[PDB]
Amino acid sequence: SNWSSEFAKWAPTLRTISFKGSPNERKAKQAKIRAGEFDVVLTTFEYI
DNA sequence: ATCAGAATCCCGGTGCCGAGGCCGCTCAATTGGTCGTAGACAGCTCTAGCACCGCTTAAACGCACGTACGCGCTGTCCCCCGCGTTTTAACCG
């Protein structure tokens, strides 16, 4: 969320896809973006 | 709670066949030597086993609740035991 915080104040207009928490929030996220529209994905190690 | 009585322990006596000691008579155990070799010891390599933490999530844990079944109780009936009588096949020689 730090990296997203510099993705917040230090620049807008480029969206972010994070991955955190239980599988439900993810189901919302990659279920919405399943069609692959986004500027940037911000993820962490074991989620790849 | 108690005597009648049937089974059992206890004690004294007796007869016997197996336990225990002896004596030749081996033949395998002991000794003395060799001879080759399995493993004891030192050394080297490097693999998997040890500890630990980060991080996620399927499983365990605690709890509320219902009802399925374990268990106690009762009645029934049937079948296996205790005993007498009779027969036969085990036993012993």
UniProtKB/Swiss-Prot annotation:
Component of the SWI/SNF global transcription activator complex. The 1.14 MDa SWI/SNF complex is composed of 11 different subunits: one copy each of SWI1, SNF2/SWI2, SNF5, SNF12/SWP73, ARP7/SWP61, ARP9/SWP59; two copies each of SWI3, SNF6, SNF11, SWP82; and three copies of TAF14/SWP29. Present with 217 molecules/cell in log phase SD medium. It is found in: Nucleus. The gene is SNF2. This is Transcription regulatory protein SNF2. The chain holds residues 829 to 876 of 1703 of the full protein. It comes from Saccharomyces cerevisiae (strain ATCC 204508 / S288c) (Baker's yeast). Involved in transcriptional activation. Catalytic component of the SWI/SNF complex, an ATP-dependent chromatin-remodeling complex, which is required for the positive and negative regulation of gene expression of a large number of genes. It changes chromatin structure by altering DNA-histone contacts within a nucleosome, leading eventually to a change in nucleosome position, thus facilitating or repressing binding of gene-specific transcription factors.
